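Audit log entry. Action: structure prediction of a protein-small molecule complex. Ligand: 4ER. The ligand was supplied as SMILES and no pocket hint was given, so placement is left entirely to the predictor. Protonation state taken as written. Sequence taken verbatim from the request; no trimming, no tag removal. Recorded inputs:
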Amino acid sequence: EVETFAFQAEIAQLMSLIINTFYSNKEIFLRELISNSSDALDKIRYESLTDPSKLDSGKELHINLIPNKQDRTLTIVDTGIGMTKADLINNLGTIAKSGTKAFMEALQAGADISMIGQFGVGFYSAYLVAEKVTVITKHNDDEQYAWESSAGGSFTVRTDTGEPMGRGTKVILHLKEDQTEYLEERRIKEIVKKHSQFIGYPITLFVE
Ligand SMILES: Nc1nc(N)nc(-c2ccccc2Cl)n1
């Protein structure tokens, strides 16, 4: 059973802007996704301080970067708080409608696409390098779900079974044909060192 949803007009317009605007500095997508993973890990850590049973679904707090040259995918995995089905549908737990407006108002005031994360819509920078994004998530209070979108104004949500993750989120970037540099170990290392060198969780770059 697959449910299909329309993006709010402002988010569809943001995604169109990210896909169609000429902007060479695409590598910033990884900083944005690692930042989101770090925020999610902070949230489950904070909840666990008063309720240790919140970590029964996994005590390890980490971020994994997994490139797959055969599938042409780059996956960002974390063991953070994860998201409920309601969160996924409601713009992946964000205020993306007001965030998009604040980003647009900033772009007109002298901002560039690299400042997208300041407006709480950094996730959508994934569409700088991906033709499709799959978000697999598991929150302690809900079942495992898969969100997916190839932009075009809609996203899908379905239950995800067979590979239970315990708790957290997996962001699967199905890369554009001309963006395979983001599967290369030296390129990922370079971007992590440049933009995410002080993240407070272990970042493990998987090899093939
Ligand atoms: N890694 C991760 N974990 C959560 N909980 N939310 C996010 C998130 C935050 C904002 C927009 C989109 C996503 Cl997928 N990412």
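Audit: result stored. Residues 36-37, 40, 78, 80-83, 92-94, 123, 135, 169, 171 surround 4ER (CB under 6 Å). The beta strands are 2-6, 63-68, 73-78, 130-138, 145-149, 154-159, 168-175, 203-205.
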